[PDB]
C-alpha cells in the first residue's frame, strides 16, 4: 500500500491504501516503516 500525505504522520489529514482492497482518509501512530 502506500500513504498519501501532507503532513508526515498523526498531523492534519493523511490519505492511505491498503490492499479486499480499503482506502481511508486517516491520520495516526504510523510510527516508522509500517507493515501488514
Given at each position: 500500500?502506500?500513504?498519501?500525505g501532507?503532513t508526515l504522520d498523526?498531523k492534519?489529514?493523511s490519505?492511505?491504501?491498503?490492499?479486499?482492497?480499503?482506502?481511508?482518509?486517516?491520520?495516526?501512530?504510523?510510527?516508522?516503516?509500517?507493515?501488514?
Amino acid at each position: 500500500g502506500w500513504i498519501f500525505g501532507t503532513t508526515l504522520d498523526s498531523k492534519t489529514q493523511s490519505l492511505l491504501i491498503v490492499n479486499n482492497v480499503v482506502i481511508k482518509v486517516c491520520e495516526f501512530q504510523f510510527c516508522n516503516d509500517p507493515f501488514l
